[PDB]
């Protein structure tokens, strides 16, 4: 039973914890300019703050 349960148990390296800060990455279609990226970031920040 020990052997079976040891086999069953999944593996990892380190647990992840709440830290109060996280990040968001935005990638537009290739050849996009600054204005479209600014519009997308405005959408993102408006959603986050509303």
């Amino acid at each position: 039973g020990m052997a079976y349960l040891f086999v069953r148990l999944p593996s990892s390296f380190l647990p992840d914890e709440d830290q109060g800060v996280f990040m968001t990455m935005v990638q537009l279609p290739a050849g996009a300019t600054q204005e479209r990226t600014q519009k997308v970031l405005n959408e993102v920040t408006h959603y986050y703050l509303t």
Partner: protein, 150 residues
Amino acid sequence: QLLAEAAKHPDMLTSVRPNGLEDTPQFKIDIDQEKAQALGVSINDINTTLGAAWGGSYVNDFIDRGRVKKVYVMSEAKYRMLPDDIGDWYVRAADGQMVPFSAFSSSRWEYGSPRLERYNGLPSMEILGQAAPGKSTGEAMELMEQLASK
């Protein structure tokens, strides 16, 4: 292909994304040095004009409120936005007459990559992802390892 195959298991892999810009079109300006030299202009003048107008050339330093800051020289927005604007620039010839840039130049569109990544010397490309909720990163690693052997 790997991304398409990994998109088929939402129960274990979530937010599987690449890390880097994919590919962009590029602009190529063909300068006919034969015609340019026949007209009277020099290659150095053409190169300096193009680089300073469109790329911007760092020139010198100057003090400002007791601090040294650089002075830049660059075209003013409106004249470096479209390919046709390449016809608005003029170059002085040998005898002093001014010749337009569009009498000895051509334009061509090509393809290219904006960023190239190498791992351990060999060329490589990097992707990221997160394990699905209720799962562990080890299972995601195992699933991607077994997906990579095809």
